[PDB]
Amino acid sequence: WGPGETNDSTTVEPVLDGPYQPTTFNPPVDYWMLLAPTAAGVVVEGTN
Amino acid sequence: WGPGETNDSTTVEPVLDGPYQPTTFNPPVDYWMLLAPTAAGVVVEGTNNTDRWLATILVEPNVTSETRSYTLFGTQEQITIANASQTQWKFIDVVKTTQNGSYSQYGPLQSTPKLYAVMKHNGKIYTYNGETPNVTTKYYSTTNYDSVNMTAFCDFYIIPREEESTCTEYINNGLPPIQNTRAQANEDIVVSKTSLWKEMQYNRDITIRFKFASSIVKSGGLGYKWSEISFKPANYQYTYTRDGEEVTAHTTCSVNGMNDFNFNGGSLPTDFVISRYEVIKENSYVYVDYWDDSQAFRNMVYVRSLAANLNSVICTGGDYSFALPVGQWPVMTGGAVSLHSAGVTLSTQFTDFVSLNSLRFRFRLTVEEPSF
Amino acid sequence: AQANEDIVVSKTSLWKEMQYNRDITIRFKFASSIVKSGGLGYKWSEISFKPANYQYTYTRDGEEVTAHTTCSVNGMNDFNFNGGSLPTDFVISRYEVIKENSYVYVDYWDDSQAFRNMVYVRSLAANLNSVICTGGDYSFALPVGQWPVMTGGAVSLHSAGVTLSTQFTDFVSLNSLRFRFRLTVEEPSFSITRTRVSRLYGLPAANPNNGKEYYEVAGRFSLISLVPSNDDYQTPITNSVTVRQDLERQLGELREEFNALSQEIAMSQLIDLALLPLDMFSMFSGI
Amino acid sequence: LPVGQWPVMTGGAVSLHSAGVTLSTQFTDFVSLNSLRFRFRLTVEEPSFSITRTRVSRLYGLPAANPNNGKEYYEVAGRFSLISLVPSNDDYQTPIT
Amino acid sequence: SEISFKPANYQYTYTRDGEEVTAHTTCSVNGMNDFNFNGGSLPTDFVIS
């Protein structure tokens, strides 16, 4: 005695946080922002 | 006989398509666009770029016929706005019909929730307008209504047309409130006198045929996202002959330990997003509940031992096509899994004077090429 | 090979059908899995149920019984809150709540002789009382701002029968008794603060324990089973406490009796007997 | 057993009653010893031995499994009377052995 | 296969009329009943030959 067959769900990360959109915010310290622009011109701005 | 206790799930929609941040996009036909701006000024703009330009501006209560600088389609302009509300906020529509064309005012909508609703349909632009809690709908004439984009500078939801009722009350009152929260002892009794039993070893061929079943739930909205791609208990029935005796059999396939992959193609309503789809790997098993009418399964109530020797099988991945409204259809394909009999189980459940038995062959899995 | 063959592994056994009525006090505690999605931390990837093991001891009828319980759920509903695509927005990718369309399995096993007699089981009934499993208070620790809290959530459990599973491996046989409880939604409703998702009925996986170390349901369980009893009727013919040979007689009584018999003797017949040469056979045959 | 409940052999009892004593020999490595061999008749007693996990109960005797029941030894106290014939050719001597 | 008796030797010392006497004994048994348990023909079942 005596456990039985049981519900079991394993979660797998996608591999990336997800392709996010262009918008304004202040990402937390100790985190990298990786831009992948499609067209030339301005891509990223940083203003304190 | 004979289904076993099988894995089950139920995916409940969030209630809305979700707050999609303010970004430029072109919603398809027959989809209501709802906006709940946080700040006054320009909130939503709809442009066909050839002969129709529309915009909505949210004005605070107690605003005289004053001029303010607003950015429409990228150009600053001294737009004039008037208001007489005390407690409400005024949504004012502004229209023009050329790149250099003059501007005009139409509307308005004096509402408390700061919620506006627009849509396109059959060469018309529908908008919720009037007064609460008795709001009405209005239609604006135009050409090439399908070419109009709708770029919003404030967070906006998308709703299907069929749920316009929920849209209507959503203009009666804002989106659901943020809620702003803070006898005894032991007895044994013989029910039947001494019985008489024996022990028998039945060896029989088993040719178990099981087929998977896939549950496909697509998230509401435009239709570029799928809410769930899961496995489902798959029933099957058949017949086969052994030793000259015909026997009918029933089978029920299911999975356990499945891995949930969740690809994200972006939050734009037109991006291909899979909220959650299930794939079986090294750390997953596939159960097959089998039962027939042979003499053996009649004599399987009181079982002292069961040993199954089965030949492994390879299950490939089929071709499924996602029917996106526009673009190119993604197709899931590939993936081969080899099954190995990792023992058997006998599950019995009781109800009054009737019991349900189930012979569950559990197969462990090994991944092999081709990939998926 | 192919075709059919049946071989008798053991001859006619001897079994009897018994019915054991015993009080069972099942205690069970939930367990939650909290997988936070990689990133800023404002989004939680999974708030799910996980099988929860527990061990305890209780006394019934003056006997101490140690029991083990394993709580799990089935048919749970997956709610998902989508608070925005910004990395700073609060999002719950998938969290599980149990409703009318959900069951909670409780796999129970102890060391009482009834369970030892439970292998070949004919019928099982479990008169069990209902319990109100509430939801605790779990705080989502965001990097900044007010921490959202999941609170509330209660559900009533009712005895929806019992299952007995037996999985065979090599030559061992793992058994498992499974009390499956069906669920009824009732107040208070649960909700997560600083969000529009509120007044939903169920018991979310955030804190099913609610501080309580174990949810208890007591009752009676009746097990009509078949077991190995010969009814003390398979033993050796002579098996018993050694039969006592009773005391015979004190010799004085015997002298009295023989002297009393002395007057019953006929003289002619006595002398006639007193000429037969009584040998060993003659004297010891007539006794 | 590595699997399932562990059967236990409990119970079992017999009374040893003295019945007869004779001469016997103990075989050592390099000498042989004269010894007294006592017979004991067995009488079954109330404790009945049974094996758990089995259809065995109300069996009487003393199995060989654990007949000592943890006791260091089984003890009987009594007296033996011996009369020995010692070779003697005079009334004043008497051999010790 | 078997669970049976075996003769056993013992040594000790005890007092007799003030004499510490060292004693040696050897216990054996005869006329025994060979019971048996046969759980089944499988290698799994409890069997006492």
Side-chain angles (χ1 to χ4, degrees):
Chain A
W1 295 81
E5 297 280 322
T6 309
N7 261 294
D8 196 317
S9 292
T10 305
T11 292
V12 295
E13 302 92 356
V15 74
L16 302 171
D17 201 316
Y20 287 153
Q21 54 195 131
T23 36
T24 297
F25 78 126
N26 41 320
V29 72
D30 292 82
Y31 281 85
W32 226 273
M33 197 188 189
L34 158 56
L35 278 96
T38 67
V42 302
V43 306
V44 81
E45 277 68 28
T47 65
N48 62 333
Chain B
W1 305 80
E5 293 281 322
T6 305
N7 278 318
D8 200 322
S9 297
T10 305
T11 291
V12 299
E13 301 89 1
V15 76
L16 295 162
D17 201 323
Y20 289 148
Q21 48 151 268
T23 40
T24 297
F25 85 119
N26 42 319
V29 73
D30 295 85
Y31 283 91
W32 253 109
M33 191 187 183
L34 166 58
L35 280 92
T38 69
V42 300
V43 307
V44 75
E45 275 64 39
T47 68
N48 73 337
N49 320 282
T50 175
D51 87 322
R52 183 67 58 175
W53 293 259
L54 177 144
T56 325
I57 34 172
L58 177 56
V59 182
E60 304 169 0
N62 178 18
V63 164
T64 63
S65 309
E66 69 186 1
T67 323
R68 296 187 163 290
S69 185
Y70 300 141
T71 311
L72 284 158
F73 202 174
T75 174
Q76 308 183 5
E77 187 59 13
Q78 300 266 79
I79 279 282
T80 197
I81 42 163
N83 190 11
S85 273
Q86 273 83 12
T87 322
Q88 275 72 24
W89 294 59
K90 195 168 194 167
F91 279 87
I92 294 154
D93 204 58
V94 192
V95 189
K96 75 152 74 203
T97 50
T98 318
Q99 288 183 128
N100 183 32
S102 176
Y103 261 120
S104 179
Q105 278 190 350
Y106 296 102
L109 169 52
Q110 289 179 347
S111 305
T112 178
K114 302 168 64 175
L115 251 64
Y116 199 70
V118 66
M119 180 174 71
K120 67 169 91 74
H121 173 87
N122 205 313
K124 306 194 246 179
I125 286 163
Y126 278 76
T127 84
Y128 266 81
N129 262 111
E131 205 69 18
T132 61
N134 189 16
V135 179
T136 169
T137 84
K138 290 198 170 188
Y139 50 88
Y140 281 91
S141 179
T142 169
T143 53
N144 213 22
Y145 83 117
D146 222 329
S147 177
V148 307
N149 82 324
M150 284 286 182
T151 186
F153 306 134
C154 65
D155 205 1
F156 77 98
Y157 305 115
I158 196 79
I159 306 194
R161 189 169 194 283
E162 181 259 26
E163 286 186 359
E164 66 161 3
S165 304
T166 73
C167 294
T168 295
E169 72 93 350
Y170 262 52
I171 315 312
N172 166 22
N173 186 24
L175 56 106
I178 314 310
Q179 45 61 37
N180 62 44
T181 320
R182 323 296 286 284
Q184 268 85 11
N186 267 321
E187 294 294 327
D188 56 46
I189 51 179
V190 85
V191 308
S192 96
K193 315 193 140 177
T194 313
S195 308
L196 206 66
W197 300 68
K198 58 183 184 181
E199 216 168 19
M200 281 264 183
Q201 184 175 316
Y202 297 149
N203 283 307
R204 313 218 171 246
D205 285 320
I206 187 171
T207 70
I208 180 171
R209 298 167 184 172
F210 73 101
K211 107 173 238 314
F212 293 87
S214 198
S215 186
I216 297 135
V217 173
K218 85 173 285 178
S219 196
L222 281 73
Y224 296 80
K225 30 168 74 70
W226 264 249
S227 158
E228 189 74 41
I229 290 292
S230 169
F231 280 104
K232 197 164 186 177
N235 308 263
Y236 183 72
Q237 179 267 110
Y238 56 94
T239 79
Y240 65 101
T241 87
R242 57 189 182 202
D243 201 70
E245 284 274 352
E246 292 171 348
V247 290
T248 81
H250 297 56
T251 318
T252 289
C253 176
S254 173
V255 278
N256 184 1
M258 57 219 92
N259 301 266
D260 308 338
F261 277 79
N262 49 2
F263 166 73
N264 175 29
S267 187
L268 307 179
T270 194
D271 284 3
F272 172 75
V273 192
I274 289 281
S275 179
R276 170 157 75 83
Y277 72 104
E278 290 175 330
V279 74
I280 52 177
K281 302 195 148 266
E282 309 296 69
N283 66 262
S284 168
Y285 305 103
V286 60
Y287 306 145
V288 199
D289 181 357
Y290 169 102
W291 77 88
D292 54 354
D293 290 70
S294 62
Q295 294 162 331
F297 272 63
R298 186 130 54 232
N299 295 119
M300 203 185 274
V301 185
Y302 298 129
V303 50
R304 190 242 93 82
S305 177
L306 267 168
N309 297 342
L310 314 174
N311 294 274
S312 301
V313 58
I314 295 159
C315 312
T316 58
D319 295 352
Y320 177 80
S321 307
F322 292 96
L324 296 172
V326 85
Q328 305 285 12
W329 291 357
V331 277
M332 302 250 180
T333 191
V337 72
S338 185
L339 278 53
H340 292 82
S341 64
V344 74
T345 315
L346 184 133
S347 199
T348 309
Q349 197 190 347
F350 308 139
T351 316
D352 289 342
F353 296 104
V354 300
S355 319
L356 304 166
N357 288 301
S358 71
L359 196 70
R360 192 188 288 277
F361 297 90
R362 60 187 300 279
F363 291 109
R364 88 191 162 72
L365 305 166
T366 282
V367 305
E368 68 173 17
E369 67 199 355
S371 191
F372 85 92
Chain C
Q2 270 81 10
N4 266 321
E5 294 294 326
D6 46 43
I7 49 184
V8 300
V9 305
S10 97
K11 317 188 145 177
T12 318
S13 308
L14 203 64
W15 300 73
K16 74 179 175 193
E17 222 159 17
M18 269 274 199
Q19 173 176 128
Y20 302 141
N21 278 296
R22 314 214 175 239
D23 285 316
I24 185 168
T25 72
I26 313 89
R27 301 168 191 175
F28 67 108
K29 91 69 186 181
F30 290 85
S32 189
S33 182
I34 296 141
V35 170
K36 75 181 285 180
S37 200
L40 280 75
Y42 295 80
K43 36 167 72 68
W44 263 252
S45 159
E46 191 70 37
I47 295 291
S48 170
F49 281 107
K50 194 164 186 176
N53 297 270
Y54 186 74
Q55 179 266 109
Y56 62 94
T57 73
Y58 66 107
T59 73
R60 63 181 182 198
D61 203 69
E63 285 284 357
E64 301 167 347
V65 284
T66 76
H68 302 59
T69 322
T70 285
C71 179
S72 168
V73 282
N74 189 13
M76 59 222 91
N77 305 267
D78 310 340
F79 277 75
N80 48 2
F81 164 63
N82 173 24
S85 189
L86 304 174
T88 192
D89 279 4
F90 180 67
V91 184
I92 289 280
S93 180
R94 168 159 75 81
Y95 75 106
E96 292 174 330
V97 77
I98 54 175
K99 304 194 152 264
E100 311 304 66
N101 72 83
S102 167
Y103 301 107
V104 60
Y105 301 148
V106 196
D107 197 358
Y108 170 96
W109 77 91
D110 51 350
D111 293 66
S112 69
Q113 296 178 340
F115 269 66
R116 277 178 222 300
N117 280 308
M118 186 167 287
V119 189
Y120 300 135
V121 55
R122 192 264 263 290
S123 186
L124 205 53
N127 294 343
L128 308 169
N129 295 276
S130 300
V131 58
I132 308 157
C133 309
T134 59
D137 300 355
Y138 180 69
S139 306
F140 293 90
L142 299 171
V144 83
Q146 291 279 4
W147 292 1
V149 284
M150 172 154 309
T151 193
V155 72
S156 179
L157 274 55
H158 298 265
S159 63
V162 49
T163 312
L164 187 124
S165 202
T166 322
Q167 194 194 320
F168 300 127
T169 301
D170 290 340
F171 289 93
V172 288
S173 311
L174 298 177
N175 265 123
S176 75
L177 191 67
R178 196 192 288 280
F179 294 87
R180 60 188 294 278
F181 294 118
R182 94 194 169 80
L183 305 166
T184 284
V185 299
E186 59 178 13
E187 67 188 351
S189 191
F190 88 92
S191 176
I192 66 199
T193 58
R194 295 182 158 71
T195 307
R196 59 187 175 277
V197 185
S198 322
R199 265 191 59 90
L200 285 170
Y201 279 84
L203 179 122
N207 270 331
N209 283 348
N210 194 100
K212 287 192 174 63
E213 198 175 7
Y214 66 92
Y215 291 118
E216 166 187 25
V217 298
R220 329 236 305 159
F221 94 89
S222 60
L223 160 67
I224 312 189
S225 173
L226 207 77
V227 303
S229 294
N230 300 290
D231 291 346
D232 61 39
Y233 208 89
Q234 264 307 314
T235 46
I237 283 171
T238 55
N239 84 318
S240 267
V241 80
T242 304
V243 66
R244 276 224 312 288
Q245 300 166 226
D246 40 359
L247 318 182
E248 299 306 322
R249 206 177 166 96
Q250 55 139 351
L251 306 175
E253 296 287 354
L254 279 173
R255 320 215 159 143
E256 293 291 320
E257 292 293 319
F258 260 34
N259 302 336
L261 292 173
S262 179
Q263 58 184 306
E264 297 295 319
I265 315 190
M267 275 191 285
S268 300
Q269 289 77 344
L270 185 65
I271 273 60
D272 195 350
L273 175 57
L275 303 176
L276 188 67
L278 289 167
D279 62 328
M280 326 272 309
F281 177 79
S282 304
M283 205 187 186
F284 303 133
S285 37
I287 306 177
Chain D
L1 299 312
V3 177
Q5 97 175 226
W6 263 343
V8 81
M9 198 163 268
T10 324
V14 300
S15 266
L16 282 52
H17 319 256
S18 194
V21 65
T22 89
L23 285 295
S24 173
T25 303
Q26 312 264 51
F27 298 157
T28 57
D29 175 276
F30 70 117
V31 316
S32 181
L33 291 170
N34 290 340
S35 79
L36 252 69
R37 185 176 296 178
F38 307 75
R39 251 188 311 109
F40 305 88
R41 155 183 78 274
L42 294 322
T43 280
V44 165
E45 306 265 320
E46 186 45 302
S48 196
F49 74 95
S50 51
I51 329 181
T52 38
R53 200 207 157 281
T54 52
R55 38 168 42 106
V56 160
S57 65
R58 296 180 182 276
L59 251 72
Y60 284 88
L62 188 32
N66 180 44
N68 287 234
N69 183 103
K71 268 182 181 263
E72 182 38 272
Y73 49 73
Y74 281 125
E75 195 231 34
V76 323
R79 213 156 147 99
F80 76 84
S81 324
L82 164 90
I83 288 181
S84 302
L85 292 174
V86 301
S88 295
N89 88 298
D90 38 9
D91 45 6
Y92 68 98
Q93 274 184 347
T94 313
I96 274 166
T97 294
Chain E
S1 85
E2 250 151 38
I3 173 153
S4 100
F5 278 97
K6 176 151 45 38
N9 299 267
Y10 187 50
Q11 283 188 308
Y12 56 101
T13 284
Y14 66 116
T15 174
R16 209 170 44 182
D17 289 280
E19 313 267 333
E20 73 305 331
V21 153
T22 291
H24 179 67
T25 78
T26 306
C27 153
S28 147
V29 288
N30 261 64
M32 310 186 262
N33 316 42
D34 308 309
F35 282 90
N36 88 314
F37 185 90
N38 214 324
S41 272
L42 313 169
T44 284
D45 288 333
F46 194 179
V47 154
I48 298 270
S49 149

